[PDB]
Assembly symmetry: C4
Homo-oligomer: 438 residues x 4
């Protein structure tokens, strides 16, 4: 109703939206910068801290040949050195180190007490680990726990070891997490509770393990306890078509835990355990491949068996392993179908599934003239790269019953990892002259 009063409503409104935008610009920008810093700190502060469980994300690498990881020469050195009488060993890793493991027998090899160390079980045996390619010396070995029946594995945070000790009929296991005990299972069938004698594998903190309690030469009760933080999460009686289970050797990839055991009853074809470390579920069967990997065994047939035991040889065998990855599939055996000597790695594609598969390639590890034993799986789960480098060890057993002109029984170790190249093979024996030992 007059300019003198509408220009005043004009000078105000025209200066508001200025203020109102500038403020909005300052307002929102102070927000974004302060939201920037709050996230910076948080991350940089998270990063000052650490660790998580490991997940079986990657798959195996292509196996074209095997290369040498480690060797302890144990027996050689401790003809003149305080080196522990062990047997039944295996390799395992932690985020930032891999170490040997074995069941110490309580004496040094020269020690007199090393007499009669061929007995598997007593109050003097103990899961110890020690630095890769060092011996089980008196001064360098770390006792992980007491007894004569072990497994161990890291879950990505810390490690879990399980020792079984006791008389034949009254045995327990203790599950150490983070180096303290947590759980003790008691024998259920009271006839030599036993387990893996090689590393276990964990997906997101779940580490299953395979026990057997019962006849070594008949039906037994095997169980697939799933472990997290040493506590028991669940157990399943064994199911599937494996008819006996002993001394499994295990690996994992693409969130599946495949274990490759010994049939000590009628088997000469190895049983196999498939495990889902999430559902906490398992199936089982035997390697199909006609190519018999136990020990002793009949001679390779043309065609084998998937869901029954390969007959011929009963009440015996050796701990062995495989990597069953389709065609990238390699199996491991003694060379002999009689005794514990020689070792090879056979590419036998589709071994798990194909009851007529045969070898396309190989590599000798030990000649069929030098002595050997047990052998199992592991991988550097914390290695770099995009694939899991398949690796195995083999136990080279000197002493009774084979070279019985010494009174002891101990061993040494050889371990190897996959190569994607095709490498010249050597052979790898214990290296010790038994006669030096008299």
């Amino acid at each position: 109703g007059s300019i003198i009063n509408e220009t005043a409503d004009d000078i105000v409104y025209r200066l508001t939206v200025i203020i109102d935008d500038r403020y909005e610009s300052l307002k929102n920008l102070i927000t974004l910068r302060a939201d920037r810093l709050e996230m910076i700190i948080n991350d940089n502060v998270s990063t000052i801290l650490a660790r998580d469980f490991n997940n079986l994300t990657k798959g195996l690498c292509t196996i074209n040949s095997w290369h040498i990881y480690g060797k302890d020469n144990a027996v050689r050195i401790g003809e003149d050195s305080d080196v522990l009488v062990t047997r039944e060993p295996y390799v395992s890793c932690d985020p930032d180190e891999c170490r040997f493991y074995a069941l110490s027998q309580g004496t040094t090899i020269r020690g007199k007490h090393s007499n009669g160390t061929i007995h598997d079980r007593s109050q003097y045996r103990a899961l110890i680990s020690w630095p890769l390619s060092s011996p089980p010396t008196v001064y360098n070995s770390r006792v992980e726990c007491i007894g004569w029946s072990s497994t161990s594995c890291h879950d990505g945070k810390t490690r879990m070891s399980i020792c079984i000790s006791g008389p034949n009929n009254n045995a327990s296991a203790v599950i150490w997490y983070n180096r303290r005990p947590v759980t003790e299972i008691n024998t259920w069938a009271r006839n030599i509770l036993r387990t893996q004698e090689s590393e276990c594998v964990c997906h997101n903190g779940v580490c299953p393990v395979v026990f057997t309690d019962g006849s070594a030469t008949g039906p037994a009760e095997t169980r697939i306890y799933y472990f997290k933080e040493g506590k028991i999460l669940k157990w399943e009686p064994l199911a599937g078509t494996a008819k006996h289970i002993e001394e499994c050797s295990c690996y994992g990839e693409r969130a599946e835990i495949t274990c490759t055991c010994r049939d000590n009853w009628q088997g000469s074809n190895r049983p196999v355990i498939r495990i889902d470390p999430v559902a906490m579920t398992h199936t089982s069967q035997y390697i199909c491949s006609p190519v018999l990997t136990d020990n002793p065994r009949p001679n390779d047939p043309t065609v084998g068996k998937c869901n029954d035991p390969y007959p011929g040889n009963n009440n015996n065998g050796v701990k062995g392993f495989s990597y069953l990855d389709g065609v990238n599939t390699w199996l491991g055996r003694t060379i002999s179908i009689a005794s514990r000597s020689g070792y090879e790695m056979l590419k036998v594609p589709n071994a798990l599934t194909d009851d007529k598969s045969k070898p396309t390639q190989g590599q000798t590890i030990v000649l069929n003239t030098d002595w050997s034993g047990y052998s199992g799986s592991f991988m550097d789960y914390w290695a770099e790269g995009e694939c899991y480098r398949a690796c195995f060890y083999v136990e080279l057993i000197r002493g009774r019953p084979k070279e019985d002109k010494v009174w002891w029984t101990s061993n040494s170790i050889v371990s190897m990892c996959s190569s994607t190249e095709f490498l010249g093979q050597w052979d790898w024996p214990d290296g010790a002259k038994i006669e030096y030992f008299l």
Copy 2:
């Protein structure tokens, strides 16, 4: 008045309004993020530092059996390895590590100096500790202190070690804390200053310790010292009904320390110093039970003495322990009454307070055809869970006096912890074969 000069006034007023208004909304905001950024920065920096004093917040776990914990097989290994001569062993945990302790006699077992290692006090002895279930060796054994009587514990922040050294009549204690010497305490009765010979116990930095200076059998001058940071907060003469005290085996539940000690003056019924480390006070009595846990000892009566001494066998004893916790009460003793051999643990509800209390459970540890020795209390005040798993070591004695064919005395160690399960029992001998040393 005008409506120009007065309109000016107006346009400035109205604009002034929102300018302040936008000033303060922007004001208030920096303030807010500033304060919000300052809150994260020190919440974050806090997490990066600090570590606190252990408080005995927990009661004890149900004891239903005992699982093997540690073993060293020392005498077995030391038959052919640089293992130290020792005796008076025990265990004590840190926040990050359980270890074995002993009095070293500054010689290896196969060492000529092993000769006359039966003696108890010498210029050459010392408190060593080592990785659990290793043997005490020259190369891995850490000396905490020089002396011939010892205790150690961890305040939850650092560790205290007490050693005593000297001629019977001139002994003095040195108190180490953080690995450095702190307090010294001279003999008061001029006759062998002594202490627990097994690990002490802490609550809020207060670590009590039972001390003794006088006759092996008289009256003696036992005192309770209340330490913290290796410094003396207080000490008090011994009160209560205890005729005599030595070598207490302590342990901590819900803000209270119970030490079962050794009675030489008459003891086959042990005394029990009970301490409160907040009030800083104690109270001694006896175990009422007719299950006499001292050696040598009379056979067992049907009813025993509740707070006096029943002679029986007289003037000699043995170090030793129990766990006193109503129905969940456990005490151990050598099988034998003659001598330091065999060891059992026995479940005796309310044994301290009931003079007719009888055994309701057992677990042989060492049979009565192998040797044993001193025996003791410790716990991992650091594990996780709702309660403390009771643990004890048993000392396993070889050489003099009971095996005189040899010129020396050493020992191994064994230790069990409790279990919530009824685990089957094994025995646990040292292993050693004397004839191998001859």
Copy 3:
């Protein structure tokens, strides 16, 4: 518009401008301090670890005298103690620590399996590091990797080890990065694949290694592989006017790596490999100087040869080294022109480039009446200062073939670094008396 329009209009304007100048002045500030922080934050965060690839950014320190650094006296301790039988040693530094390295023979000097350690290659040899100046004991010596020829270097981030193993006709290199295998490489001329047997040298992540495969008595196939993070970036075949290459000893001045090798065919002067590690290329020749530094060799002439072997001595030589840095050029060689005997250093201004060059200074390390052997070079790449300190080692072989008294071959180690002052000189014999070994 009108008269009042153009007045209000000029109140909006003058007040917009002002507000804007203030908005910009405020925006600009809030921005800056936001930026100030993050930057400060990131930096001050980053300081809470870090680790960059090493860069050869310094020349050599002026060498006026050599001074002592390490010695293990290994053999002397070994007389009575579990030391390992070894040879082919070296020294190499991590950013925080420098270790002696060598190849175990899988046995102790006092062990019976020292019988026959004259042999260069078996299934029982391992690369090893251990504490600088202490001895290669079973207990302190950590296997880097498994092989019978090797090398090792650290990029300032982590460390690369390379072990070659297998039969003569089928050997295989494993490359280790940060303590796990990265890559293998099969033999190419199938004649004892072999490499440096002293440390390698990184520049900004590229660590070149020189390998040989083929004749040792005639003309061979030699390659310079270039590793980063244990992965192969490239491999150049040998080039320029060197004719045979063995046992190269390298160092790094300003972004060059100069490696002095050994002509084991017709060579009695030493080949040289100047590598450009950025362009990942090389070039090669012999040292021009008449001061021949092979072994065995001819007496020295007035004039040597820049570009062919010096003839006169055939199918043999020694590992050794030089530092060629202009007038700051020093050489090492045995004093015996016939045998692995004694060791001296001679300053020879421009040894490499002027075939008339003689000594203008010297120093003795091992008198001629003391055995020596393989020499090699290293520098602690991570010392504070303006230049690198040239260091070297002299393996000192004992036993066969030169002392058949014993059945065995081993070594001890001495090692000097350079000094800008002219210091007195001492002799650094092995130390051992073989008599004792008899």
Copy 4:
């Protein structure tokens, strides 16, 4: 309006300035705050400073046991190294025994003839308190037959003189890396402390001699820091001859107790201000003579010249020289290296007629002693530095000649504020057992 408009633009400007100003200031004064804060809190994540001797001695009313190896005893059946000239140095986290290695075990045939001092096969080693010097525990710092080693609170300085009599050098190490190297200045067994040195705000004085064991010689005080020669002095004061100093710090002063090898049988004494980097010398005045061999104690001793008796001989020893809190150490015998003892001698350094007012037997006169030297754990908790020392127990030769070697073991004590009862601390080797 053509002036009234000005006034409106003008007035709201001032108000916006008043507002902009306020904002700019609070922002500034709030960002700073956070720049400080973080930077401060960030330094709390990092670490160590140079040690200053800011404290005084504790009151010695007796000495308590600290550590003991049992080296000869254990190393009867154990791969223990032959040593001698031991000592003890603390780092801010551990106290380690140090000695001179001889490059063989004690049952190695190689011990034959290890009596000798200087040989290519010697290094300064070190190992963990009360443990013995073993093959697999003994880490090495440098190489040579003469040494001193001390931490400035940031890190360690080991030192080793190697070489022939007439051409020796000292290589000084800083943080485990050779930094400097010095050469003989009178080419005659260049040598130093044989015990631990002592730092103050990272200057670390070391005492050296090069010259005659048997006459006027060239003794020098080098002033170190991070392994560098800031300065060096020649001897001053009234000490006619210095060897084998045993040094200790308190209240920003380093005090050393050395050995006159030439004519003295009272111990000479270097006092060093580490800051002004300047010193003097004299002798302990006390007629409680302290060296060995030594003449029988007189009534009065000498302050500023050697006490006559026994030329051309000595043993390395130490003392705490702190007014009425002075305590002298010495062998019991005047003749050999046997028994060892502590005596309280109010004002030994200044009072030329001071005699005991108390004392403690460390080692019986029927047992071997040897070298002894001052150390102190400058990184203890408290308001005072606990006076500590070690004694070398020499077994073997020359006094025990039915073996062929010369090893030692260690004993070490620290001061107490209590009057603690006493014991004796022998090596414990039974010589017979070797034969």
